[PDB]
Amino acid sequence: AHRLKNAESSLYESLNSFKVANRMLITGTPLQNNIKELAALVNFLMPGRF
């Protein structure tokens, strides 16, 4: 899921437009450079709560 660490990358808008009820991310490094990567991951998971 670290490949999904960028919100502006085309994979993010490709996977965020999918009509899926439940999502899950498997990764080894959740944070790599800053808090914004984790913010993008939790926005992909829960869009609005965090």
Q: How far is the CB of 16 from DNA (least distance, A)?
A: 12
Tell me if 9 contacts DNA by CB under 7 A: yes
Q: How far is the CB of 37 from DNA (least distance, A)?
A: 8
State the Cα–Cα distance between residues 38 and 30, nearest whole angstrom: 7
Residue with tokens 């996977």, as numbered in its chain: 15
- 37 in helix, strand or coil? helix
Tell me if 10 contacts DNA by CB under 7 A: yes
State the Cα–Cα distance between residues 5 and 30, nearest whole angstrom: 9
Tell me if 17 contacts DNA by CB under 7 A: no
Site residues, DNA (CB under 7 A): 3, 5-6, 9-12, 32-33
